[PDB]
Amino acid sequence: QIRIGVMGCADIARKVSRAIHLAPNATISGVASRSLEKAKAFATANNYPESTKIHGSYESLLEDPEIDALYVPLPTSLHVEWAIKAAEKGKHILLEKPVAMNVTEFDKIVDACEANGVQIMDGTMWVHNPRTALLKEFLSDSERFGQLKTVQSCFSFAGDEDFLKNDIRVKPGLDGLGALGDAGWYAIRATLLANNFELPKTVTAFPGAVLNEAGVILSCGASLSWEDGRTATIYCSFLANLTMEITAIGTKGTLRVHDFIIPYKETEASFTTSTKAWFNDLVTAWVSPPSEHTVKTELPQEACMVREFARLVYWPSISRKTQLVVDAVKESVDKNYQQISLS
Amino acid sequence: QIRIGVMGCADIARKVSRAIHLAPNATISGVASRSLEKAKAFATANNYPESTKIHGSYESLLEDPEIDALYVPLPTSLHVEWAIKAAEKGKHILLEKPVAMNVTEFDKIVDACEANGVQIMDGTMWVHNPRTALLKEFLSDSERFGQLKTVQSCFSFAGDEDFLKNDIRVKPGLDGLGALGDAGWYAIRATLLANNFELPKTVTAFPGAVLNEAGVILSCGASLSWEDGRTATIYCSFLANLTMEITAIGTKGTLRVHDFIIPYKETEASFTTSTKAWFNDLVTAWVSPPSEHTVKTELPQEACMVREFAIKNNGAKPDGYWPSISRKTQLVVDAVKESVDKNYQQISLS
């Protein structure tokens, strides 16, 4: 129903087209590129239907009156410009993250979407997976889980040579936020979902960050304490083996997710669970060890995501919440690991 | 054959007592206490052998010529005084962690032990567990793991109101290091262990440390750096649901164990491994999810510990790895608090 236009021939557009496709309330209507030559080839391999119009410019697609909404798979650097130009043309945006090089730029995109009354949603997929429902709640049980104390979050894949050298996520002019923007983002996001999505008191980075010659981050972490007994940590890197964990330590429960970003199988999703856990009298063993739940996801998360993009006309809000923490962490790295209080 | 005495009828002494005679190269030969009545009750309660000489005093047990070594589950603060005296009476030492209120006091204890040739060791039993040999085995292979980067570790649990108010761990005297010495201790060991026993360059406690009204730590954390990529984190809390684990990750490997301090079952031990993991072309699934391993451990780790601790027959000197794997861990434990009460300074371990 909602005519979707893919602005940018990004490799990750191969997965989202599926989302769009599988979303019973959405269809892939338009798609552009710097050269319709590439858009034609992308549309071919990607099994794009025939009615799908092929454009050889971004301006073309933005002025395409038949565009109800857009998915923007462009490098972090083309958001502040192409996002404002998308809304001004009355088109709703599904913006890939990191949303922008800073909250300042994001707000400009938010306001612009507001002035034009359009719906904007970042590209963080996992928060739409069903598992994220029965767990966002698992942490809302003041008994089975209790009062949140701290929450850890990690993520780091292993950028081979070609990646560390050519991928756009190491280029200061393209996806200049590096590991932070591409990976830290997720950790930061979970660190918010565990806390009901409330900005933390302050934010402090750990020393020992790794930036390439151009100064792009390759690895770094940080603690974000709500100063009221709550703290947390994230961790991202382009130099370590694939790992995706969420550690949440509550007063009465403990939650753990070995995946969370892209599950093992798009069909099912699982997470840990533990409450009133203790040892027997002689501390010779655990009396009741943590259990692992599970939920069926008949529709992939990117699918469930796009099937939710239909917001006729929070999302732009929680995006700014993580984008913000994103900057705090980045500001801290260079502002001599200072604590970045968030108002 | 190795006669061991127990100074201080602490509750943790019950578990170690079972470890002592599951030996079979060690036995219970003696037990002491500030009170003979409390020691008389302890010996019989825990089914000690008639042969065990029940001691109604510390000094009395040390001056006992028929006691080869001692297990000292004494409060932290009593260590530097009573451990030393023990070394001075020719008594080897199995000292409970955290070994002391600081490394200076611990150096003395160690130099006292050297001076008498006896062996000293701490109560960190999880390293004697067979699994740990395979954990280090994995972290050692540079092909299925590679160079180390992170190995975060934490330990917490929910202490009842009775604990939070009367346990020796909340007091600033006996075990005055709080959750750091009781819990942070391990997490630090697990990191040092992952980092081939190499201390970090510097230490920087995290913000939001919760100290009581007496300045004793109830929960806290921090990060460590080596100026490579090797960065880790430890977390400890006396007021947060039970949770323990090690999460190490390298260029090619990832290690995971969620019961590294107290195995679910003493019978076996499991650890998960992941080598060069990735996604299918379209990233709709992992090409291969982590691997769960399981090791047989017919002999529980604490007993494996006492078994190793248990020179006097061949003329060998004391093993320096232990007092050294004890000074390193006890050297950093006092690096954290050194930052939690020093304006969050990046303690320079130089």
CATH number at residue B28: 3.40.50.720
Measured in degrees and rounded to the nearest 5, phi and psi for residue A334 equal -90, -20
Q: Is B144 on the interface with A (CB under 8 A)?
A: no
A250–B231 C-beta distance less than 8 A: no
State how far the Cα of B15 lies from the Cα of A336, in Å rounded to an integer.
48
* B240 CB within 8 Å of a chain A CB: yes
Distance (Å, whole) CA B200 – CA B223 = 9
Is the distance from CB of B195 to CB of B132 less than 8 angstroms?
Answer: no
Spatial separation of the C-alpha atoms in residues A148 and B112, rounded to whole Å: 45
CB pairs under 8 A between A and B: 193
A-contacting residues in B 292-321 (Cβ below 8 Å): 300
> Where does residue A249 fall: left (phi above 0), alpha (psi -120 to 50 degrees), or beta otherwise?
beta
- Pick the residue of A242, A274, A288 with the most B CBs within 10 A to test the interface with B by mutation: A242
Which of A18, A149, A279 has its CB closest to that of B240?
A: A149
Q: Are residues B276 and A241, on separate chains, in Cβ contact within 8 Å?
A: yes
User: A230: which chain B residues are within 8 Å (Cβ-Cβ)?
Assistant: 208
Is the CB of residue A221 less than 8 Å away from at least one CB of chain B?
Answer: yes
> CA quadruple B258, B262, B265, B269: dihedral positive or negative?
positive
Q: Which of A242, A263, A236, A262 is nearest to B277 (CA)?
A: A242
β partners of residue B349: none
- In our burial notation (b when 16+ CB lie closer than 10 A, e otherwise), range B243-264 reads bbbbbbbbbbbbbbbbbbbbbe
Structure tokens at B295: 């090791």
H helix and E strand count, chain A: 11, 17
Strands A53-54 and A69-72: unpaired
Q: Are residues B115 and B194 in the same domain?
A: no
| CA A188/CA A183 separation, integer angstroms | 9
DSSP state of B210: E
Tell me if A48 sits within 8 A of A17, measured CB to CB. Answer: yes
| Contact assessment for residue B225 and residue B200, using Cβ atoms and an 8 Å cutoff | yes
Inter-residue contact B332 to B195 (CB < 8 Å) = no
Query: Are A111 and A145 in the same domain?
Result: no
Cα B197 to Cα B138: distance, rounded to the nearest angstrom? 15
Task: Transcribe A87-99 into DSSP letters.
Answer: HTTT-EEEE-SS-
Beta bridge partners of A216: none
Distance CA A325, CA A124 (A): 15
Cβ–Cβ gap B262/A247 under 8 Å: no
Declared resolution, Å: 2.5
Taken as a whole, chain B contains a residue count of: 350
Q: Where does a domain end: A73, A108, A128?
A: A128
Beta-carbon contacts of residue A302 (< 8 Å; ≥ 6 apart): A15, A16, A18, A19, A125, A128
A222 CA: distance to closest CA in chain B (Å): 9
Q: Mutation target for B interface from A15, A22, A129, A243: give the one with most B CBs within 10 A.
A: A243
How many folded domains does chain A comprise? 2
Closest residue of B to A203, CA-based? B207
B168 CB neighbour count, 10 Å cutoff = 15
**CA–CA distances in Å: residue A261 to residues A11, A131, A237:** 18, 11, 15
Whether residues A156 and B146 touch (CB distance < 8 A) is answered with no
| Contact between B218 and B236 (Cβ < 8 Å) | no
Amino acid at A215: G
Whether A148 and A238 share a structural domain: yes
B68 φ, ψ to 5°?
A: -55, -55
CA distance, residue B26 to nearest chain A CA (Å):
20
DSSP letter at A18 equals H
DSSP H helical ranges for chain A? 13-22, 36-45, 58-62, 79-82, 84-87, 103-115, 161-166, 178-179, 185-193, 301-309, 315-334
Nearest to B150 among A15, A235, A254 (CB): A235
* Most distant CA atoms of chain A, gap in Å: 73
Looking at B111, B128, B145, the residue that finishes a domain is B128
Cβ-defined contact of B241 to A265 (cutoff 8 Å) = no
Residue A161 burial class via C-beta count within 10 angstroms: exposed 0-12, middle 13-18, buried 19 and up: exposed
3-class SS of residue B152: strand
Spell out which residues of chain A touch residue B219, defining contact as CB-CB under 8 Å.
Answer: 149
Q: Do B220 and B290 belong together in one domain?
A: yes
Same domain, B119 and B144: no
Residues B43 and B149 grouped into a single domain: no
Closest CA relative to residue B148, chosen from B188, B196, B202:
B196
CB-neighbour burial class of residue A198 (10 A; exposed 0-12, middle 13-18, buried 19+): exposed
- φ/ψ of residue A48, rounded to 5: -60, 130
Pure H helices in B155-221:
161-166, 179, 185-194
Cis peptide bond prior to A172, omega within 30° of 0? no
Q: Are residues A79 and A113 in the same domain?
A: yes
Any chain A CB within 8 A of the CB of B45?
Answer: no
Alpha carbons A9 and A35: distance in angstroms, whole number: 10
Find residue B257's DSSP bridge partners.
B246
- Compare all CA atoms of chain A with the CA of B155 and give the residue at the minimum distance: A249
Q: Are residues A111 and A133 in the same domain?
A: no
**Which residue type occupies B332?**
V
Residue A98 CB partners (closer than 8 Å, separation 6+): A76, A175, A177, A180, A181, A182, A185, A323, A326
State whether residue B109 is helix, strand or coil. Answer: helix
Same domain, A166 and A259: yes
Structure tokens at B254: 């990832």
Domain region containing A241 = 129-343
Q: Report CB contact under 8 Å: A149, B15.
A: no
Q: Which of B281, B209, B278, B203 is nearest to B238 (CA)?
A: B209
Task: Answer yes or no: are the C-beta atoms of A105 and A84 closer than 8 Å.
Answer: no
- The sheet that has A53-54: what strands, in order across it? A53-54, A26-31, A2-6, A69-72, A92-95, A120-122
CA distances from A336 to A205, A211, A332, B150 (A): 9, 14, 6, 22
Final residue of a structural domain among B94, B128, B162:
B128
Is residue A140 classed exposed, middle or buried when 0-12, 13-18 and 19+ CB atoms within 10 A define those classes?
Answer: exposed
Q: Name the residue in chain B with its Cα closest to that of A302.
A: B284
Sign of CA dihedral A191, A192, A198, A203: positive
**Omega cis (within 30) before B263:** no
Q: Are residues A307 and A230 in the same domain?
A: yes
Q: Which residues are CB-contacts of A133 (< 8 A; sequence separation ≥ 6)?
A: A295
Which residues of chain B from 47 to 106 reach within 8 Å of chain A, CB to CB? none
**Are A167 and A313 members of one domain?**
yes
- Domain CATH code at residue B275: 3.30.360.10
- Cα distance between residue B11 and residue A217, in whole Å: 49
Whether residue B180 contacts residue B335, with contact meaning beta carbons closer than 8 Å, is answered with no
Statement to judge: residues B134 and B28 lie in one domain: no
Chain A residues touching B204 at Cβ < 8 A = 206-207, 337
| Number of Cβ within a 10 Å radius of residue A138 | 20
Q: Which residue of A has its CA nearest to B219?
A: A229
